[PDB]
From Swiss-Prot:
Effect of V223I: Found in a case of cancer of unknown primary origin; uncertain significance; somatic mutation; the mutated receptor is constitutively phosphorylated and can sustain invasive cell growth in vitro
Chain positions covered by the region annotation Interaction with MUC20: 249-284
Origin species: Homo sapiens
PTM (free text): Dephosphorylated by PTPN1 and PTPN2.
Annotated positions binding ATP: I27, G28, R29, H30, F31, G32, C33, V34, K50
Residues annotated as catalytic: D138
Family of the protein in this entry: Belongs to the protein kinase superfamily. Tyr protein kinase family.
Protein name: Hepatocyte growth factor receptor
């Protein structure tokens, strides 16, 4: 029943090696549910297996097409797809989980250098996605993960794209407090609106995961911004990094820096720090 050209094209994505899905070990549950897993080939690889609903032959066609597209994306700062198989999406397990919880954790002691380092890795992952004409639409610290080497990987990508939390989404995903001014008015997204979201992600990093605009309700953000306001400078945010955030929030989308310019500018700032400045959480 399926297009035979598509069946041959998806073969390099489909996994036979073999996979052991640990169905009793759940991660999260919107859309489908994520479980722990183990891959093969004479080695055991810890993975996160997402099982999507019960999806018609056209739905199966999209699933196989998405798998090929996803597999064509490879970058150390972008969460990879290991393969596909109910439809199974197999992703590498990220030991330290999401970036927002990692920095919020009071037992963690990040320095200014470490936090800027995480922002730099996110910028590199986004620089890769933009070059592939991929518009993320939901870049936030909650949507970035950390592996065992503390490598940051931009997630919430392709078949894994979901809504895991609700308080950050106005009820198509609308992460209002991370959205560019023009996206709040048109509901359209570009690489330049991902640049706005990246400026917000840098603010999340420097405040160790504080919610942005805490005293502003989701529905009020566009009026708040149009009065001539931006997120205030975090206490442990260096002046050149705050200048970078302000550039990410330029009212004119085309005047915002590209992710390539961000990688470059942030690499310079990052290089000036030695890991002697401990970042503490704000009381407010
Ligand atoms: C002591 C406190 N603390 C310290 C360690 C901590 C982390 C454990 N490590 C993991 O949880 N790793 C993990 N890797 C992966 C790899 C892929 C996927 S699918 C996916 N694609 N994009 C996103 C974006 C968001 C989400 C989710 C949000 C809520 C539930 S899923 N899923 N998602 C999920 C996980 S979850 C647990 C306890
Ligand atoms: Cl430092």
């Amino acid at each position: 029943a399926l297009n035979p050209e598509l069946v041959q094209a998806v073969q390099h994505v489909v996994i036979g090696s073999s996979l052991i899905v640990h169905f009793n070990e759940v991660i999260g549950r919107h859309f489908g549910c994520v479980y722990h897993g183990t891959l093969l080939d004479g080695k055991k690889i810890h993975c996160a297996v997402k099982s999507l609903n019960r999806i018609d032959i056209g739905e199966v066609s999209q699933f196989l097409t998405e798998g090929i597209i996803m597999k064509d994306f490879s970058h150390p700062n972008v969460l990879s797809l290991l393969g596909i198989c109910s439809p199974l999406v197999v992703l590498p397990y990220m030991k330290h989980g999401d970036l927002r919880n990692f920095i919020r954790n009071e037992t963690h002691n990040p320095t200014v250098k470490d936090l800027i380092g995480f922002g730099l890795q996110v910028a590199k992952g986004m620089k890769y996605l933009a070059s592939k004409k991929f518009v993320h639409r939901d870049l936030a610290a909650r949507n970035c993960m950390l592996d065992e080497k503390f490598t940051v990987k931009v997630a919430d990508f392709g078949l894994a794209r979901d809504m895991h939390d609700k308080e950050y989404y106005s009820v198509a995903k609308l992460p209002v407090k991370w959205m560019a001014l023009e996206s709040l008015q048109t509901q359209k997204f570009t690489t330049k609106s991902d640049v706005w979201s990246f400026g917000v992600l840098l603010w999340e990093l420097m405040t160790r995961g504080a919610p942005p605009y805490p005293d502003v309700n989701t529905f009020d953000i566009t009026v708040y911004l149009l009065q001539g306001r931006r997120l205030l400078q975090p206490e442990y945010c260096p002046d050149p990094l705050y200048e970078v955030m302000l550039k990410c929030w330029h009212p004119k989308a085309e005047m915002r820096p590209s992710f390539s310019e961000l990688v470059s500018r942030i690499s310079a700032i990052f290089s000036t720090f030695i890991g002697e400045h401990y970042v503490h959480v704000n009381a407010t």
